[PDB]
Design a protein around this ligand. Structure first.
Ligand SMILES: Cc1cc2nc3c(=O)[nH]c(=O)nc-3n(C[C@H](O)[C@H](O)[C@H](O)COP(=O)(O)O)c2cc1C
Ligand SMILES: CS(=O)(=O)CC[C@H](N)C(=O)O
Ligand SMILES: O=C(O)CCC(=O)C(=O)O
Ligand code: F3S
Lengths: 1472, 211
């Protein structure tokens, strides 16, 4: 994959611009899935100017006369198999161009060579044809495209009405034309020779290859699109899409004249995310806005409220943000309206984008940098884009604008501020009334009874509400979610329970809402929905909150300011009502809001307030959706704000759902109440009820910001109404009828059930007195109502069983377990088969089976050292495997002990904060598990409370003692699937023997990703259930993120099968598997391996008391405390017994089924039948979609060979060859080689080899040194141990020294480059990610997230993008230059100095955990000096040398950045 | 049709230009309920006035004409197996060589026209030219015609006497050379047939005939 762009700064056309454009496209394949087929690829494209010589001649050769104007071309994909349709297609195409009365010189079959296409693709190949049009009407450049635009839509539309498939017009303008198709980019020129003609000349270029979650090639989905080209993904798409359904309700501009209606819907079916973007971007530009304005209105930069930003810009930004809600997601963009050409970034700089400027007056935009030869000699600059920036060219004036200067320009266009000043911030007005006193008007006798209506409890009040009020933070907890899944529940659960928060896995990264809160946002606006098409100050006239969240005080504040303008709808219904009560209720509300809005109303207030003994409340969630949708469905939502008052609301989740299913504003009124009551028994102590709410509110605000970040979304306006949930349990019909689009893969209950349950709980609370809520056993087993998997009896019996070693006791446990009411989906399945039973002896053996079992990754830290190694011993004893876990593994452990026991773990993880990740760690295993996610907390990343960060722990992890370890939610080197792809490459490079796994978490859509993972060379894929365990994690994720494995595991099984990849990868699953049958059923759904954690913990003794986060483990399982660790009685022997039983119980089952082995039953879903009905009312689920087979009946067999999906060599292949002496004799060596952007992970293999023979540190620095001219591609020197040194004279791309491990890497411009070392980029992003040792020197600037997570590498570099030194925990980080926003966020431990010539660092640095001072003590001043010296010595850097020359005056200019938590720890204090 | 009205009336045509079976067929199955070639009943009359039929009543001459047009049709219909006119009507069972796509789509039922051709504009023009000829001037009689047979008229033909001669010559005297002038006679005219619109260029350089 890649996007790129090239432009002649002067405006004047040239052939090189195209030849370069090709040139690029020939250097991106190293980033894609190569087929063994040699031909097949996902899509490539080049968007250049229609070449009028070339075309005109053509018209001449047929013997017409060339017009004076520009001649248009339509580039069109016609149906290729039904001639009947091609015609219809061409009549339509002609008719439409005809009624604008332009002129047709006529069709031209494009030459192409289909030999380089694969069949898959030739299959879906359309018939590519050009049609040539002339501007007989003598209109203007601008009018021609305008008209053509209305024409293309007209066609587009008619073909649709005709119901014609496969028709598609890539381009149709007289300025630009697009040559895209499904073929390898390196072969664009081959599939389309026109491109090789010298008449193809152009002032600009835009190329783009693409990847996918598929095996299927659609042609129209290859880019570049008509104005756009996008690298990344736009996670905020459904959000955007539904907004346009309303934005459109009002869009009207005069340029389209009477055409608008043909103009809508601007977004047709079947578009890829980017495709939809181009769609919007286009209309906007067709109506007048420049390119750069549009990048902004749609992919605006973050308005951090800071000095970093001039005030013009801020105005503008604020303007946009008020018109259009962003289109978020990682995004490198290459854009152009007719005149300008733009390179742009998303608001988080999520994708690479280097660029070079030449003496010849060209700018070449890129994704990597070595992408197209240019002589250093003619380089005038070497830049990049950072979050939010753009760079551009105005081709009419042949002027280049860098970000500042370009943004300057746009600020210039209008009185942004004067206009912005037109908004009413009703904030202060609202805060005022709060301080004036958050009221409360119910008597406990009430609170209690309503509360009972929504089935609330003490656990609810104590466990969850309280901490919010107190700490202003939400409840953290531990252990998995073992309760039933709500539909199956026995006990009133509220709608919000069935909506699961979505989150993101490999497609895009989730953000850090702590360390990166400045880019996020919760602004809310009522009435800012008018004409995205307009550009007038009247667009700022709207009210603005700063949180959709309102305390009963603030709420009324607002509701008053509104007034005649608001309308209140009664979200409630009679109980005397009848079977259809709630239905008609839902109609009613729907209608009433209609009338209101029509009637003139501008704000709606939906509410349960009139709930009483005679009226049940309509589930706020359902009521909000029913309303918002119908509002959209009638083009009305654009006229109001929709505000909800809810008695049932209480936690963060409930807000999130409400908001994103419509809600503008929410007020949890009966909870502020419940807060008060608590407060008048002084449960909060001294603290005023007002400060009370304040906190509550922050907890819910950060609440949301988080839930959002789980699918990288930075901003509530795009999130709102986006329906980002997945419904488990409610009926298809329903979810469709009333909420935005969401999946509900098995219908579930419907209104009639909902009604019945709502009312039942109701009687509970108005049928008689209520002094206390029940206790509740949702977050914990009480011997009360809610059941759980793990309950006391069950735990005892199991313990009894593995301790006394009786299989009979085991069997009694599992029976205890299997004889209950259904609690989980698998519980609803029976296993029946058609074979007679077989004798048990005959089945496969335990030895055999237990080997398919593994003990999941549970970190050293989360668990006691004793527990951890216990597990490693058990697994190795039975020839199985265990998983180190998120947090290091002690290397002493790399040998078997006198007793023969083996503490080393067989599968090592690799997770966001790269904990103990070392060349030697990565090499002490058979398998690497890339942890993208756990079912306990999908969107997010580990926690390890500070008081667990023992010293041993801290030593392991290179973290700082007793300081907390919260991990970055996303991996920093996996922002998109190609990214995954490359990590897997490095992984397979540093360790030639291991298989690589990807931990993913079930959720709908996993299937597809699963595929991409497969194309990315992963060997195993593991789908984790929503219910798995965690040692520490917020409770909403433990109860609301994730989906059951029975759904995700089949989806992966299916989809992978459906694309013929299912044999390329092995499948594993975990999530609550405690029993023989749980394991058989998982096999039949497709699994080959099963993970067993918690139950293995319980055998080691866990009693499931849930204080894993607390460091108070009654039993030594999950606690670092010494005394407490002495109460541990786990034993290998115990765990081994657990597995032994499990397998035997598996064999017992297979025999009954007639199979003599597990393999004979994988995928065999025909052996499972869904029985269970388990409720009073006819409310059933559809378990089909899970049981279905893709290619039922006999399967063909693809031979799979034993081993791992192998990978292509790199430079290391030769380097190693050339190093014989090294390994053979010990010699020292110096090698030289060139290097291209296309060579990845250079050295890594070397390193693996060296680490293996001499170990990370048995070689003295520089022992083997390899100079490289040119460009290093991603992962340069990744995991290099000491002894290796790489000099890259030239430059590099992302991830230099990723996981650096005591090796050394230096990078400087070519002796001959005339560039000013420090005023130019030289290495990409996420450099030194997670390093632990070694040095890195860089004559130049580095890009975003430099030194992220560095845990002990020393570096020197002349500058650095934003988010630098983030989450750093060790090492020294010098920095000869300016530094990006948010520097040092979360930087708990190492040190960075920072030459700052403008005393600006103050404006950029992230205070929170760090401080800066000028050097005072002189050993710190000396430390710096020596590095800088080294730097120079290695890099021959002038600018550096000079700082050395004036040390005296200069030292004065730096700034010591030192972590708070390091102040008292530091041998030599930092101060005098 | 498009506006749901066709189910309300019958659609009846009076046409001057109508003479033979084909014209009726097209008309009919392109809408027509009823047709009446009124300037032919006339042409017939004139014929019958100068006694070209016998002392046969016009009434009778008309009858015959009708019968031929009836069998005119019945026949055109059976070429496609259709046995009944209600079903044939409006069915559009033609194929347009020559008219433009756009046009045929706009105005007639669905019929293919694998190559758009002329459109309203040309039609207009050619219509009007032929109209001048009959009013913006003076006219004695209809020309001869050379449609159904080459006369040494304006309607050309592939096989016209000249070329025939040269061919016959060529192949009797047996000279390739004579053959070669015939082909030229034949190849040098204005286009009369689609192949005629195609040149033959190639990108190889010539090879010696012997090869
Ligand atoms: C205490 C504990 C620690 C865990 N630590 C990690 C970890 O370090 N890395 C990881 O990728 N998943 C971790 N997980 C999840 C497990 O690896 C596995 O996905 C899940 O534990 C198995 O769920 P089950 O508990 O119902 O047996 C942890 C889970 C628990 C309960
Ligand atoms: C190379 S790419 O993975 O960024 C593809 C971009 C986009 N989401 C698409 O589906 O086309
Ligand atoms: O130990 C750590 O860093 C993480 C452990 C963890 O996140 C979990 O077990 O839920
Ligand atoms: S608190 Fe964890 S619950 Fe198991 S580990 Fe101790 S009993």
């Amino acid at each position: 994959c890649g996007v790129g762009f090239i432009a002649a700064i002067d405006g004047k056309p040239r052939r090189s611009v195209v030849e370069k454009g090709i040139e690029a496209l020939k250097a991106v394949w190293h980033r894609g899935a190569v087929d063994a087929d040699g031909k097949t690829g996902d899509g490539a494209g080049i968007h250049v100017a229609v070449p009028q010589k070339f075309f005109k001649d053509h018209v001449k050769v047929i013997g017409h006369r060339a017009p004076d104007n520009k001649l248009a071309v339509g580039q069109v994909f016609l149906p290729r198999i039904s001639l009947d349709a091609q015609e219809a297609c061409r009549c339509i195409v002609e008719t439409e161009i005809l009624a604008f009365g332009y002129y047709i010189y006529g069709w031209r079959q494009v030459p192409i060579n289909v030999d380089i296409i694969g069949e898959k693709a030739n299959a879906t190949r359309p018939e590519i044809e050009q049609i040539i049009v002339g501007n007989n009407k003598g209109v203007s450049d601008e009018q021609f495209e305008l008209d053509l635009y209305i024409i293309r839509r007209r066609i587009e539309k008619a073909v649709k009405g005709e119901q014609i498939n496969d028709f598609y017009i890539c381009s149709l303008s007289a300025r630009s034309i697009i040559y895209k198709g499904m073929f390898l980019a390196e072969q664009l020129t081959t599939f389309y020779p026109d491109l090789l003609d010298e008449r193809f000349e152009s002032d600009f270029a835009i190329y783009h290859q693409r990847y996918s979650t598929n095996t299927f090639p659609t042609w129209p989905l290859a880019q570049p699109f008509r104005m756009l080209a996008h690298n990344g993904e736009i996670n905020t798409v459904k959000g955007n899409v539904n907004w346009m359904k309303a934005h459109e309700t009002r869009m009207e501009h005069p340029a389209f004249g009477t055409h608008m209606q043909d103009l809508k819907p601007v977004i047709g079916v079947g578009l890829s995310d980017s495709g939809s973007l181009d769609t919007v971007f286009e209309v906007m530009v067709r109506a007048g806005r420049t390119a750069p304005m549009v990048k902004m209105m749609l992919v605006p930069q973050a308005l951090t409220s800071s000095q970093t930003t001039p005030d013009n810009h801020k105005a503008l930004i604020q303007y946009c943000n008020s018109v259009m809600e962003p289109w978020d997601g990682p995004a490198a963009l290459a854009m152009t309206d007719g005149r300008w050409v733009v390179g742009g970034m998303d608001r988080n700089g999520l994708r690479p984008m280097r660029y070079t400027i030449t003496t010849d007056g060209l700018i070449i935009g890129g994704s990597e940098t070595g992408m197209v030869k240019i002589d250093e000699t003619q380089v005038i600059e070497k830049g990049r884009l950072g979050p939010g920036e753009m760079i551009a060219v105005d081709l009419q004036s042949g002027k280049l604008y860098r970000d500042r200067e370009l943004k300057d320009h746009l600020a210039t266009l209008k009185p942004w501020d004067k206009w912005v000043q037109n908004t009413t911030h009703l904030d202060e007005l609202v805060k005022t009334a709060s301080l004036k006193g958050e009221p409360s008007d119910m008597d406990k006798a009430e609170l209690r009874r309503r509360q009972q209506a929504f089935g609330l409890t003490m656990e609810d009040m104590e466990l969850i509400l309280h901490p919010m009020v107190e700490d202003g933070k939400e409840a953290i907890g531990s252990m998995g979610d073992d309760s039933p899944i709500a539909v199956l529940s026995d006990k009133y659960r509220g709608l919000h329970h069935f909506f699961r928060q979505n989150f993101s896995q490999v497609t895009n990264p989730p953000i850090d809402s702590l360390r990166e809160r400045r880019v996020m946002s919760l602004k809310t606006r009522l009435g800012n929905l008018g004409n995205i098409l307009d550009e007038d100050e009247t667009q700022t006239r709207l009210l603005q909150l700063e949180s959709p969240v309102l305390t009963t005080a603030e709420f009324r504040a607002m509701r008053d300011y509104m007034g005649d303008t608001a309308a209140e709808i009664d979200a409630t219904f009679p109980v005397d009502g009848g079977p259809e009560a709630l239905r008609d209720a839902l109609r009613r509300i729907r209608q009433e809001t209609e009338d209101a809005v029509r009637g003139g109303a501008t704000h709606v207030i939906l509410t349960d307030e009139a709930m009483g003994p005679a009226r049940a409340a309509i589930p706020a969630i359902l009521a909000t959706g029913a309303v918002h949708t119908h509002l959209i469905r009638s083009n009305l939502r654009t006229f109001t704000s929709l505000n909800v008052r809810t008695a049932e609301g209480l936690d963060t989740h409930y807000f999130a759902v409400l908001i994103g299913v419509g809600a503008t504003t929410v007020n949890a009124y009966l909870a502020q109440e419940a807060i008060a009551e608590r407060h008048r028994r002084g449960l909060f102590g001294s603290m005023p009820l007002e400060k009370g709410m304040a906190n509550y509110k922050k907890a819910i605000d950060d609440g949301l910001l988080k839930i959002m970040s789980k699918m990288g979304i930075s901003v509530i306006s795009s999130y709102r109404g986006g329906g980002n949930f997945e419904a488990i349990g409610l009926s298809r019909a329903l979810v469709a009828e009333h909420f935005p689009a969401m999946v509900s893969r098995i219908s579930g209950i419907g209104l009639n059930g909902i009604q019945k349950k709502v009312l039942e709980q109701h009687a509970t609370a108005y049928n008689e007195e209520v002094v206390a809520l029940p206790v509740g056993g949702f977050y914990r087993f009480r011997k009360s109502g809610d059941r759980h998997g793990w309950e006391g009896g069950v735990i005892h019996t199991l313990q009894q069983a593995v301790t006394n070693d009786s299989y009979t006791t085991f069997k009694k446990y599992s029976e205890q377990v299997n004889k209950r009411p259904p609690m989980q989906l698998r519980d609803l399945l029976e296993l029946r088969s058609t074979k007679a039973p077989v004798p048990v002896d005959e089945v496969e053996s335990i030895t055999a089976i237990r080997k398919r079992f593994i003990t999941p990754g549970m970190s050293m830290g989360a668990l006691s050292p004793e527990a951890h190694g216990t597990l490693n011993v058990a697994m190795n004893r039975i020839g199985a495997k265990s998983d180190s876990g998120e947090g290091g593994e002690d290397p002493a452990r790399f040998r078997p002990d006198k007793n023969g026991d083996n503490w080393n773990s067989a599968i090592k993880q690799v997770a966001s904060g790269r904990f103990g990740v070392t060349a030697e760690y990565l090499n002490q295993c058979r398998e690497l598990e890339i942890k993208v996610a756990q079912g306990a907390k999908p969107g997010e990343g580990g926690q390890l409370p500070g008081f667990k960060v023992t010293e041993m722990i801290a030593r392991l992890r290179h973290s700082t003692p007793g300081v907390m370890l919260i991990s970055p939610p996303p991996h920093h080197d996996i922002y998109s699937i190609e990214d995954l792809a490359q990590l897997i490459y490095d992984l397979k490079q540093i360790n030639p023997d291991a298989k690589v796994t990807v931990k993913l978490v079930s959720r709908s859509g996993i299937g597809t990703i699963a595929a991409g993972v497969a194309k990315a060379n992963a060997d195993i894929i593991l789908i984790s259930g929503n219910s798995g365990g965690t040692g520490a994690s917020p409770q909403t994720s433990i109860k609301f993120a994730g989906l059951p494995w029975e759904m995700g595991l089949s989806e992966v099984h299916q989809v992978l099968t459906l694309n013929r990849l299912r044999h390329r990868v092995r499948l594993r699953t975990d999530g609550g598997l405690k029993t023989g049958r749980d394991i058989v059923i998982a096999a039949m759904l497709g699994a080959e391996e099963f993970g067993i954690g918690t139950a293995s913990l319980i055998a080691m003794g866990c009693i499931m008391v849930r204080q894993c986060h607390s460091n108070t483990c009654p039993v030594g399982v999950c606690v670092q405390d010494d005394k407490l660790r002495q109460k541990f009685v786990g034993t290998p022997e115990k765990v081994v017994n657990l597995f032994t039983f499990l397998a035997e119980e598996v064999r017992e089952i297979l025999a009954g089924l007639g199979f003599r082995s597990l393999n004979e039953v994988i995928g065999r879903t025909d052996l499972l039948h869904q029985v269970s009905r388990g409720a009073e009312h006819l409310d059933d689920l559809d378990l089909n979609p899970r049981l279905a087979q893709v290619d039922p009946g006999e399967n063909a067999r693809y031979c799979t060979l034993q081993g791992r999906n192998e990978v292509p060599d790199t430079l290391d292949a030769r380097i190693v060859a050339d190093a014989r002496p090294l390994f053979e004799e010990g010699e020292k060596m110096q090698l030289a080689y060139n290097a291209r952007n296309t060579q990845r992970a250079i050295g890594t293999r070397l390193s693996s080899m060296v680490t293996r023979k001499f170990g990370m540190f048995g070689l003295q620095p520089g022992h083997i040194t390899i100079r490289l001219r040119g460009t290093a591609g991603q992962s340069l020197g990744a995991f290099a141990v000491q002894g290796i040194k790489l000099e890259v004279m030239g430059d590099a791309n992302d991830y230099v020294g990723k996981g650096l491990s005591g090796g050394t890497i230096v990078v400087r411009p070519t002796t001959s480059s005339p560039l000013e070392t420090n005023k130019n980029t030289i290495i990409g992003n996420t450099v030194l990610y997670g390093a632990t040792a070694g040095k890195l020197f860089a004559a130049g600037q580095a890009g975003e997230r430099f030194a992220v997570r560095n845990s002990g590498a020393t570096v020197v570099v002349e500058g650095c993008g934003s988010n630098g030194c983030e989450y750093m925990t060790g090492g020294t980080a010098v920095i000869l230059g300016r530094v990006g926003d948010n520097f040092a966020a979360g930087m708990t431990g190492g040190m960075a100095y920072v030459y700052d010539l403008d005393d600006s660092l103050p404006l950029y640095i992230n205070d929170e955990s760090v401080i800066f001072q000028r050097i005072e003590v002189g050993h710190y001043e000396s430390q710096l000096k020596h590095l800088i010296e080294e730097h120079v010595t290695e890099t021959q850097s002038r600018f550096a040398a000079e700082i050395l020359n004036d040390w005296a005056r200069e030292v004065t200019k730096f700034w010591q950045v030192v972590p708070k938590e390091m102040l008292n720890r530091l041998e030599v204090p930092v101060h005098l």
